[PDB]
Amino acid sequence: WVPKTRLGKLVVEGQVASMDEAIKSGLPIREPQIIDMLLPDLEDEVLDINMVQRMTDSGRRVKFRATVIVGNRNGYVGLGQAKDVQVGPAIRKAIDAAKLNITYIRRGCGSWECACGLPHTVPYEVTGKAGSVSVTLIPAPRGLGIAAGNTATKVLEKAGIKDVWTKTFGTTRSTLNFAKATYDALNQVNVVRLPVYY
RNA sequence: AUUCUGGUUGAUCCUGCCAGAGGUUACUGCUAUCGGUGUUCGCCUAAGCCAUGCGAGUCAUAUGUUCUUUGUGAACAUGGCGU
Ligand SMILES: [Zn+2]
């Protein structure tokens, strides 16, 4: 594998080992073959195989919009989807796109009933809205599980979040918007302004 | 577990209901060994109609009469209480 950008040269030199220092570098993480060495423990799951099509003069174009979400079950998770003529190349392109979009989300115990403080649930209440699908990340008591959907359980188990209550608004049929709104909520987890004394 | 899934599209987002998925209640198809707990089994139609037995009777230290199995034993009556 030939690194191409400055981040690839830095990771091949050994200066950047984990993705946190790469994000601290501030450069664009464009090569899919950098995060695999930075995080060899990356895991992902295909979230749907919804087969799109398209109209032509003679026949009908066919593609696959398979989406795969990537996390590490510790506090890092990312979103990524891709399409191509075959399910294999489509899912592999989605895996390439997802690993470039991994982010670090800080976690704790902000539940009204839970009082542990050790990171097992969302730090506080946040929202994720991709399309009309919206998800609120209300904290949950420890040792309880995710009070969300099956794809929500997959995405939040990839992201490392353990116990959460949620709620869904709008047309929840689109699994792609469900994954993207969960991503938006997790990104709003670590963007709200916290007190300096906390 | 403060839960989603399919359906309108050539394909998407979506409003929108439809249907899926869990209780409980009533009834019921199929079907079947047993015990425990108690505060269920003609309510939902007919508060329709009823054969049969029965469900409130008791009082000898209230009065009165005949027996005896001689004893707060029974039968009758007036009467008290209760129904
Ligand atoms: Zn806790």
Can you offer a commentary on this structure?
One of its GO terms (molecular function) is rRNA binding. This is Small ribosomal subunit protein uS5. Pfam families: Ribosomal_S5 (PF00333), Ribosomal_S5_C (PF03719). Residues 42-105 form the S5 DRBM domain. It comes from Methanosarcina acetivorans (strain ATCC 35395 / DSM 2834 / JCM 12185 / C2A). This protein has 198 residues and is an alpha+beta fold. Helices cover 30% and strands 20% of the residues. It has 6 helices and 12 strands. The strands form 4 sheets. A 4-stranded antiparallel beta sheet has the order 1-4-5-6, sandwiched between helices. A 3-stranded antiparallel beta sheet has the order 7-8-12. A 3-stranded mixed beta sheet has the order 9-11-10, covered by helices on one side. A hairpin with a 4-residue loop joins strand 4 (67-71) and strand 5 (76-78). The longest helix is centred in the C-terminal third of the chain and has 15 residues, at 175-189. The termini are far apart. The structure holds zinc ion.
Give me some keywords for this one:
6 helices; Ribosomal_uS5_arc; RNA-binding; Ribosomal_uS5; 1 chains; rRNA binding; 198 residues; alpha+beta; four-stranded antiparallel beta sheet; binds zinc ion; three-stranded antiparallel beta sheet
